[PDB]
Amino acid sequence: KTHVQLSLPVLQVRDVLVRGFGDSVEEVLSEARQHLKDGTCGLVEVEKGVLPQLEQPYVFIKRSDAAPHGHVMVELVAELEGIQYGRSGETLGVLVPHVGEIPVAYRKVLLRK
Numbered sequence: 001k002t003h004v005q006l007s008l009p010v011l012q013v014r015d016v017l018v019r020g021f022g023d024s025v026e027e028v029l030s031e032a033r034q035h036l037k038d039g040t041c042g043l044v045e046v047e048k049g050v051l052p053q054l055e056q057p058y059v060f061i062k063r064s065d066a067a068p069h070g071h072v073m074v075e076l077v078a079e080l081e082g083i084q085y086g087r088s089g090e091t092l093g094v095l096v097p098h099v100g101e102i103p104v105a106y107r108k109v110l111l112r113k
Contacts, residue, residue, distance in 0.1 A: 003110045005071050008043040009103035013050045018097040020055030025078040025085045032059040032095045042098035043107050046091055056080050059095040062088030071110040
């Protein structure tokens with residue numbers, strides 16, 4: 001399937017134990033896609049002071065359309081030193097590995113895979 005319905009645990013930035021997916025744009029997009037498939041991917045909502053507490057490169061989910069079954073359609077955009085790889089809509093948040101942190105909420109997304 002070109003899209004997959006996921007429910008992403010929303011984590012508080014200060015709880016996150018593994019603060020990024022790796023060391024290159026290509027690695028973080030790779031690892032983010034693998035964690036999304038394996039159900040081990042969390043979402044941090046981006047506010048003032050969040051991104052400096054996470055590791056670059058960043059992986060964002062961004063809204064790709066204006067929402068089947070409650071699931072917002074999203075795609076992945078990476079960012080390293082102020083350059084983005086991908087073009088998409090509004091940021092729903094930054095993806096991080098999930099290693100058992102307790103979420104505050106769930107974000108239903110339809111991921112362009």
